[PDB]
Each structure stands twice: as structure tokens, then as C-alpha cells.
Swiss-Prot record:
Tagged with keyword Chloroplast: no
Major place of residence: cytoplasm
Similarity remark: Belongs to the thaumatin family.
Alphabetic keyword roster: Cytoplasmic vesicle, Disulfide bond, Signal, Taste-modifying protein
Entry-linked InterPro entries: Osmotin/thaumatin-like_sf, Thaumatin, Thaumatin_CS
Name of the protein in question: Thaumatin I
Biological role: Taste-modifying protein; intensely sweet-tasting. It is 100000 times sweeter than sucrose on a molar basis.
UniProt cross-references to Gene3D superfamilies, sorted A to Z: Thaumatin
Disulfide bond entries: C9-C204, C56-C66, C71-C77, C121-C193, C126-C177, C134-C145, C149-C158, C159-C164
Subcellular location: Cytoplasmic vesicle
GO CC list: cytoplasmic vesicle
UniProt source species: Thaumatococcus daniellii
Keyword Phosphoprotein attributed: no
């Protein structure tokens, strides 16, 4: 499957793509404002994620640091990123269908649109100014708006037992972005697409 990752932000982002235990394609790349990076994701990939990282520094060997979404200091991500990270999540060719969503469960750093480039389903978007409106206690000093589980580490926010409800914090993410997961047990906003669809992830789709 092809994913075109487009940076429409006015600032540079370092895109990342991983399935948690391995990189997807090269795993990461710098995208200056307006740049597009096309990756190939193997059919059948389950639990893949794409995210943006901000304010990165990398040396000649691809080792460094990012203020949001750092994946163990690598330019080329092999693992998931450090919150806060708005996430494009996908599972491909699962009994003939693809499943996509946007999640704020690990916080939000950059606005995103995640849409198919092929026929048969709608896209999802979370483009509200969550960082600007972020509740004081969730603001991340390095940038972004943390989820409550990251900040407070309680069974209720992290849904540790699988018995949690919405919270004042999850409702904030849900109010600004109804089409994104706001907590682990949120009413799913997953979209079913035809198996083997192709996609585009756009950072800052509106600004």
C-alpha cells in the first residue's frame, strides 16, 4: 500500500512510520513545509502508525532528539514515539478490509487529515487548535497537549482494567476533535476501507 505523507505546516516536521517493533519503509524523514514523502507499507500490516515529530536535531548518523514524538532518538523510527503525538493508525488487509483512524489517546502535537486516495471510504481529520486550547495541566513544556494517562498515570485515564469512562480531559479532546479517539474506550471512530486501499496523511490540512 502506498501512503503519501504531506507536510502542509509552515514549519518542518520529521514524519515517522512504525508498527511498534519495526520501521515501516525507511521509518522516518524530514519534511520541510510543502514536501511530500511516499512510503510503501506491506499488505497485512497490523497496528501501523504514522505521526509527526517537531523540533528535531539529528547528526550525520541519524541519531538525535525531538521535542514531540521522539522514537528513541532515531531519525528512522523502529518504535513508537514519545507523547504527545497525534496518531494516524491503520491495520491493512484484515479479512479483506483496511481499518483507519486518528487517535488523541497519546495526546496531540500536530493537526492531521488521514484519507484514502483510492475509492470506497471517507477520511478522518483532527485539525482543531488543540495545542492553543489545551487545559493548563495537560500542556507539554516541549510542545503539544498531553493525554491525561501520560500526565497522571491513573487506572482511570489509562484504562488499565478495561473499565474506564470518559473524563474531563478526554472530553476536551473529543469536543475539539469528535472524529478522533479521545480515550481507550471511546465509541470507535474507525473507518472501514476496501482492502489494499492507498492513503494520504496530511499534516496541517487547514493551516
Amino acid at each position: 500500500a502506498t501512503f503519501e505523507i504531506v507536510n502542509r505546516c509552515s514549519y518542518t516536521v520529521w514524519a515517522a512510520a512504525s508498527k511498534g517493533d519495526a520501521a515501516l519503509d525507511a521509518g522516518g524523514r524530514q519534511l520541510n513545509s510543502g514536501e511530500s514523502w511516499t512510503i510503501n507499507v506491506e499488505p497485512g500490516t497490523k497496528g501501523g502508525k504514522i505521526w509527526a515529530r517537531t523540533d528535531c536535531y539529528f547528526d550525520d548518523s541519524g541519531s538525535g532528539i525531538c521535542k514531540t514524538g521522539d522514537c528513541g532518538g532515531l531519525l528512522r523510527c523502529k518504535r513508537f514515539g514519545r507523547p504527545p503525538t497525534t496518531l494516524a493508525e491503520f491495520s491493512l488487509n484484515q479479512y479483506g478490509k483496511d481499518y483507519i483512524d486518528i487517535s488523541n489517546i497519546k495526546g496531540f502535537n500536530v493537526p492531521m487529515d488521514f484519507s484514502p486516495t483510492t475509492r470506497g471510504c471517507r477520511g478522518v481529520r483532527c485539525a482543531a487548535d488543540i495545542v492553543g486550547q489545551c487545559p493548563a495541566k495537560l500542556k507539554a513544556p516541549g510542545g503539544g497537549c498531553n493525554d491525561a494517562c501520560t500526565v497522571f498515570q491513573t487506572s482511570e485515564y489509562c484504562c488499565t482494567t478495561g473499565k474506564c469512562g470518559p473524563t474531563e480531559y478526554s472530553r476536551f479532546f473529543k469536543r475539539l476533535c469528535p472524529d478522533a479517539f479521545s480515550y481507550v474506550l471511546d465509541k470507535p471512530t474507525t473507518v472501514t476501507c476496501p482492502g489494499s486501499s492507498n492513503y494520504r496523511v496530511t499534516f496541517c490540512p487547514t493551516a
